[PDB]
Symmetry: D2
Subunit: 251 residues, 4 copies
C-alpha cells in the first residue's frame, strides 16, 4: 500500500506545501490544524479529488498542558485509524511572536504556546510515533536557520527552536536502532507573515544573497521530501539549511 | 557597597563552589535551594562567619508551573531585600535524569522539572533581574559541553540545555543596551552523581583527554568568576567549555 | 544541450560514484585523476558506452605548488573544451594520512594535505566562476562530519577540511550574485580504506547508530545529486551530514 | 624562576597588548615581529626597563614556504636561548586583505594568508611541543565572525577556519603532555590604520554591547585568563570577545 504521513500545521503556507508534495510523491496524509479548519478541509478535499481516500484532517491544540501527551498520541492514532500505518512525521506547527524580556497573554501562556508548539509537542509526537511502530520511517522537524542570530525580543521562540535542534539530535541517536531517522529543515526567510507590509517584507528580502528573495514554500518542501526519500537513507541527525545564504551574512 | 549575586541551586556541589568563590571575591550572595535547606544554611553560616551579613538563603521550587514567575521574582527580590542591589545572576539549578522516548513521574511532570529548571526558570529570573535594574552587571548560565553529543535517553534534559544556550544568546543580544552581559559555562564531566557506581565514574573519567579525571567544582567556578569579572567586560553571548577536551573525542 | 560536471579524484570509490550518478542524471563528466589512470579510463569507457562522447579524463596533481593555479585552470578549461560549458564542480579529491605533532618532509605534507583538501578547491572555484561571468550552476565540496571530533594525529588533514568549510561559506556568499550555489556533503564513515583489516573496519562500523555500517559511496553520491538538482535551488552555504548519526555519539 | 612566553606579531596593536599583559603577570616574553622592527625594539626596551632581562625580539616572515618550519623552530629556539624555557605560545600574527574569487600573485596570497593564519601556528605548535608545577599552554587568535565572513576574504577565512581545526586537533593530541590549547576570537577590535570615520562608525554601531570596538587590552584579558591557573581544565575552547557582534543577523 502507499505510505502515510502526518504533517502538523498543514492547512496553509509551508505545512500545506509539504503535505501537497508528500501527496504528489504517493503518500497518504494527515492534515493537522488548530484554528484553520476551512483551509484544512479545503486542502483535504483537493487531495482526495486527486486520489480518493488519501487525506484526512485532525484538529489539535499543541500548546503545552497536562493533556498535550494525549493530544499528540491521538494525532498519531488518527494516521493509523485512517491508513493503517504511519511512516513519516513532519513537525511543522509553530507559534511565533515576540516575548520581550523588559517591558494579552500571561507569561506562562506564552511559555506553554511557544515552547509547547516548537518543542514539547514535537517530543511527544516523536514518542508516540516511535511507540506505535521495506520500511522507510523518518521524522523531519522544521527548525530555523537563524537560531544563532536571533530576532530581537524573541527569546521564548528562539529557546523553542534550540530545544527542537536538541530533540532532532537526541531522537536521531535514540531511534536509530529502530530504523527511524530524525532530521531537520531550517528555513531562513521563507513566506513572510501575512500581517507584514510589503515595505518590511522587501527589507528582509534584500538581506538574502541568493536572489534577494524569500524561499517559496515549495523550496522548503523540496528539502523535506529529500530527507524522507530513499536518497537520504543514511542521513539522520542532520539539519539542512534552506536559507539562500542568509545565515552567512554579517551585521 | 560590595556587589551582590544570586546563585541558584547553591547548597551543594558546583553551585556551592560558585557561591563560595564569589563570596571570596567580595560578593554578598543569595544561596538558593529547593530541598537542601540544612546545607544552604550551613553554607550561609560559614560565609557569614568570614564576613558578617554577606550571605542569605532563599527557598524555591523552579519546576515550571503557574507560580514559577512569582517564585523567580521573589528570588531576585530577596537579593534586593538583603543587599539593596543585584549585580550577578548565576543559573545553576538543574534537574537531570533520563526520559526515554520508547518504553512514577508523569511525562508532563518530567517536562515541567527538566525544562523548568534548565530553561524556563533561567528565562524568568533573567526577566526579573533585568526589570529591576560604574556597574558590572552580568548573568552566567550553567550549560553542558556535551549538548551536541548527548547522553542516550536524556532528550528532555538535552532540550532544556539547548533552550538555555538559546536564552544565553537571545538575552545577550536584548540586554546589551542595558550593559547587562549574558554568558555561559559548559562543564563536561565534573562532579559525578552521588548515586553513580564508582566503576561507572571511572569509565567517564578515562574519557577525558586532559588528565583522565573530572573537573572539580572549583574549576567550573573559576570560569564563572572570570565571566563576572572586570576582565570580561566586552564578553557577552559566549559560552566557555570547561571540559578537559571531552567534547573533542570521537566515538 | 546536456549540462557538464567536473569531479576531482573520480577514478575510484566516492568520486567514481558521484561521476556515475551525475552521468545517470544526464550530465557529461570530466573525470579528474592523479595516479589512477587505468581506473579513470575504464570509467570513461564504461560511460561513453552508455552515451557516446559524454566522458573525458583529466590528469593533475592537486598538491599545492607554483603550478597549482595553472593546473586548476586547465581542469576547468578541459570541461569547456570537451563540452562547451561547465555547470557543476565537485571537489572530492583528498590526501589523507597522519601528521603527528610530536619519508615526506613536513612542508610536503602541508602542500599535499592543505593543497588537495583546501587550496585546489579554492583555485578550482575561482576558475569555475571566472569562466561563467535555465542554468543551474553549483559547486559541492566533500567535507567531513567528524571535523569537530577529529582523528588523533590528523591535524593537517583536519585543518584542510576546516578550511574547506570556510571556503564553502565564503564562496556561497560571494558567488550568490552570479547564481552559483556552493554547498558541501560531509561523510562520517563511508568506504573504509581498501587495505584496512575487517576487524579494524568493524571497530568503526560498530560506532554508527544507524545500522552499524559505513555509508556506501552511492549514499554519499545521492546527497551530491540532491544539492546539484532543481530541488536545491535555494540552498547555498549548507553542508549536509551523511553520517548515520556518528557525529552525535559521545566518547 | 619566571615562566616565558612567545607572542607572534607582538610589535603593535593586539599582540603588543598581549605581550605587555603577560609581562605584567610575571612572564618573560619573546616579541616576534616581521616588518615592525622599530616598534618591536621599542617595546622590548620598555619591558626590560621595568624588569631587566625579561624581553627579547625575534624577526621572522611567517609566509608559507619550504623554510617556514625552520623559521618557526627558530622562534621557539629563541625563547629557550634567552630564557631556558617556553611555557606559553600565543599565535597572533596574521595577514588580512581581500582575495576576490572573480599586485601579488594568487600563490603569494595563498602563502601569506594561509601561512600566517594557519601553517605557522601549526609549525610553531609542533616546535613548542617537541621542545617540552608547569602550566604549559597555547592560545590562538581566531575570529568571532568566521561563520559570517567578510565579502571577498575567502583565503583569510579559510586560514582562520583552519586555525580552529588546529586548536581542536592540538588540544586533543597534546592533552596527554599537559599542554592546553585554546583560542580567543575577537569580533571588531582595533580598526585598520586605513579606514575613515564613516566606515569605522559603521562597524562600531553594529556592536550590541556599547556600540564600540574592543580595546586591545580587552582581547589580552581573555588570553591572560586562558594561560592562568584558573583555566587548568580548559582545553580546546575558543572564547569570543566580541560584544555580541556575531549574534546580530543581517
Ligand atoms: N516562514 C518562515 O520564513 C520561516 C522561517 C524560519 C522557520 N520557519 C519554520 O517553518 C515552519 C512553517 O513556517 P510557517 O511560516 O509556514 O508557519 P506559520 O504559518 O507561522 O504556522 C504554521 C501553523 O502552525 C500552527 N500553530 C500555531 N500555533 C499552534 C498551536 N498552539 N497548536 C497547534 N498548531 C499551531 C497553525 O495552525 P492553524 O493555522 O491551523 O491555527 C499555523 O498554520 C515553522 O516551524 C516555522 O517556525 C518558517
Ligand atoms: N556535574 C557535572 O558533571 C555537570 C556536567 C554538565 C553540566 N553540568 C551543569 O552544571 C550545573 C551544576 O551541576 P551539578 O551536578 O552541581 O548539579 P546538581 O547537583 O544535579 O543540581 C544542583 C542543584 O539543582 C537544584 N535543583 C534540582 N531540581 C530543582 C528544582 N526542581 N527546583 C529548584 N532547584 C532544583 C538542587 O537543589 P537542592 O539540592 O536544594 O534541591 C540541586 O542541588 C547544572 O546546571 C548542570 O546541568 C554539570
Ligand atoms: N571514505 C570516508 O569514509 C570519508 C570520510 C570522511 C570524509 N570523506 C571525504 O570524501 C571524499 C572522498 O572520500 P574517499 O575515501 O573516496 O577518498 P580517497 O579514496 O581517500 O581519495 C580520493 C582520490 O583523491 C585523489 N587524490 C589524492 N591525493 C591527490 C593529489 N595530490 N592530487 C590529486 N588528487 C589526489 C586520489 O586520486 P588517484 O587515485 O587518481 O591518485 C584518490 O583516488 C574525500 O574528500 C574525503 O576526505 C571520506
Ligand atoms: N583587529 C580586529 O578587529 C580583529 C578581528 C578579528 C580577529 N582578529 C585577530 O586578532 C589578531 C591580532 O589582530 P590585529 O588587528 O592586532 O592584527 P594586525 O595588526 O592585522 O596584524 C598583527 C601582526 O601580524 C604580523 N604579520 C602580518 N603578516 C605577517 C607575516 N607574513 N609574517 C609575520 N608576521 C606577520 C604583522 O607584523 P609586523 O607589523 O611586525 O610586520 C602585524 O603587526 C589577529 O590574529 C587577527 O586575525 C583581529
Ligand atoms: N512559525 C513561524 N512563522 C514565521 N513567520 C516565522 C519566521 C519569520 C522569518 C522572517 C520574518 F521576517 C518573519 C518571520 C521565522 N520563524 C517563524 N516561525
Ligand atoms: N544537573 C546536572 N547534574 C549532573 N550530575 C549532570 C551531568 C553529568 C555529567 C556526567 C556524568 F557521568 C553524570 C552526570 C551532566 N549534566 C548534569 N546536570
Ligand atoms: N580522503 C579521505 N580518505 C579517507 N579514507 C578518509 C576517512 C576515513 C574515515 C574512517 C576511517 F576508518 C578511515 C578513513 C576520513 N576522511 C577521509 N578522507
Ligand atoms: N590580522 C587581522 N587584522 C584585522 N584588522 C582584522 C579584522 C578586522 C575586523 C574589523 C574591521 F572593520 C577590519 C578588520 C578582522 N580580522 C582581522 N585580522
Amino acid at each position: 500500500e502507499a505510505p502515510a504521513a502526518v504533517v502538523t500545521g498543514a492547512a496553509k503556507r509551508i505545512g500545506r506545501a509539504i503535505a501537497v508534495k508528500l501527496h504528489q510523491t504517493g503518500y497518504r496524509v494527515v492534515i493537522h490544524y488548530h484554528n484553520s479548519a476551512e483551509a484544512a478541509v479545503s486542502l483535504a478535499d483537493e487531495l482526495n479529488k486527486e486520489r480518493s481516500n488519501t487525506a484526512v484532517v485532525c484538529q489539535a491544540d499543541l500548546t503545552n498542558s497536562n493533556v498535550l501527551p494525549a493530544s499528540c498520541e491521538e494525532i498519531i492514532n488518527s494516521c493509523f485509524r485512517a491508513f493503517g500505518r504511519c511512516d513519516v512525521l513532519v513537525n511543522n506547527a509553530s507559534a511565533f511572536y515576540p516575548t520581550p524580556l523588559v517591558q494579552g497573554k500571561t507569561v506562562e501562556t506564552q511559555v506553554a504556546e511557544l515552547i509547547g508548539t516548537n518543542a514539547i509537542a514535537p517530543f511527544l509526537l516523536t514518542m508516540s510515533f516511535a511507540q506505535r511502530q521495506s520500511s522507510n520511517l523518518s521524522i523531519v522537524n522544521l527548525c530555523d536557520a537563524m537560531v544563532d542570530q536571533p530576532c530581537m525580543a524573541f527569546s521564548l521562540y528562539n529557546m523553542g527552536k534550540h530545544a527542537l535542534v536538541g530533540l532532532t539530535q537526541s531522537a536521531a541517536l535514540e531511534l536509530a536502532p529502530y530504523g527511524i531517522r530524525v532530521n531537520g529543515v531550517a528555513p531562513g526567510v521563507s513566506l513572510l507573515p501575512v500581517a507584514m507590509g510589503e515595505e518590511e517584507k522587501d527589507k528582509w528580502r534584500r538581506k538574502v544573497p541568493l536572489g534577494r528573495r524569500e524561499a517559496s514554500a515549495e523550496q522548503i518542501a523540496d528539502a523535506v521530501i529529500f530527507l524522507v526519500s530513499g536518497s537520504a537513507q543514511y542521513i539522520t541527525g542532520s539539519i539542512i539549511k534552506v536559507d539562500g545564504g542568509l545565515s552567512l551574512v554579517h551585521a
